Amino acid sequence: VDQRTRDALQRSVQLAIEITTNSQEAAAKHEAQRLEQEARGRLERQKILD
Amino acid sequence: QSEAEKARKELLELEALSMAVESTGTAKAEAESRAEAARIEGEGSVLQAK
């Protein structure tokens, strides 16, 4: 019945959306770091072979 | 780092061989030049003595 209550719940749903976007950005950052380290390791082994 | 050390072992073996070659070549060259000069001086000293 109270409008303030519904307005308070809108902040809850926008915080849930912000949480989901932060989660996908963190997953992308960790995949980027894994590929970066794999390429760096292959590059170092190739420099020693050269 | 484990894979890089696996190849770095063979790199260090080849560098050990190259250092061996360089050091023994330098020492052999200098010693043989001094021995040749000494032999020529010795035969000259024989002829001077006569």
Curated annotation (Swiss-Prot), chain A:
Induction (UniProt): Up-regulated by IFNG/IFN-gamma.
Q: Where in the cell is it found?
A: Cytoplasm; Nucleus, Nuclear pore complex; Cytoplasm, Perinuclear region
Tissue expression: Present in most normal tissues. Higher expression observed in epithelial cells with secretory and excretory functions, as well as in cells chronically exposed to xenobiotics, such as bronchial cells and cells lining the intestine. Overexpressed in many multidrug-resistant cancer cells.
* Signal sequence region: none
Q: What is known about its processing and modification?
A: Phosphorylated on Tyr residues after EGF stimulation. Dephosphorylated by PTPN11.
What is its quaternary makeup? Answer: The vault ribonucleoprotein particle is a huge (400 A x 670 A) cage structure of 12.9 MDa. It consists of a dimer of half-vaults, with each half-vault comprising 39 identical major vault protein (MVP) chains, PARP4 and one or more vault RNAs (vRNAs). Interacts with TEP1. Interacts with PTEN and activated MAPK1. The phosphorylated protein interacts with the SH2 domains of PTPN11 and SRC. Interacts with APEX1. May interact with ZNF540.
Describe its function: Required for normal vault structure. Vaults are multi-subunit structures that may act as scaffolds for proteins involved in signal transduction. Vaults may also play a role in nucleo-cytoplasmic transport. Down-regulates IFNG-mediated STAT1 signaling and subsequent activation of JAK. Down-regulates SRC activity and signaling through MAP kinases.
Tell me the domain comment: MVP 3 mediates interaction with PTEN. MVP 4 mediates interaction with PARP4.
Q: What is this protein called?
A: Major vault protein
UniProtKB/Swiss-Prot annotation, chain B:
Description of what induces expression: Up-regulated by IFNG/IFN-gamma.
Localization recorded for this chain is: Cytoplasm; Nucleus, Nuclear pore complex; Cytoplasm, Perinuclear region
Which segments cross the bilayer?
A: none
Q: Glycyl lysine isopeptide (Lys-Gly) (interchain with G-Cter in SUMO2) crosslink: positions?
A: 9
**Tissue distribution:** Present in most normal tissues. Higher expression observed in epithelial cells with secretory and excretory functions, as well as in cells chronically exposed to xenobiotics, such as bronchial cells and cells lining the intestine. Overexpressed in many multidrug-resistant cancer cells.
The written remark on domains in the entry is: MVP 3 mediates interaction with PTEN.
Quaternary context: The vault ribonucleoprotein particle is a huge (400 A x 670 A) cage structure of 12.9 MDa. It consists of a dimer of half-vaults, with each half-vault comprising 39 identical major vault protein (MVP) chains, PARP4 and one or more vault RNAs (vRNAs). Interacts with TEP1. Interacts with PTEN and activated MAPK1. The phosphorylated protein interacts with the SH2 domains of PTPN11 and SRC. Interacts with APEX1. May interact with ZNF540.
**Function in brief:** Required for normal vault structure. Vaults are multi-subunit structures that may act as scaffolds for proteins involved in signal transduction. Vaults may also play a role in nucleo-cytoplasmic transport. Down-regulates IFNG-mediated STAT1 signaling and subsequent activation of JAK. Down-regulates SRC activity and signaling through MAP kinases.
Name of this chain's protein: Major vault protein
Organism phylogeny = Eukaryota, Metazoa, Chordata, Craniata, Vertebrata
| Encoding gene per record | MVP
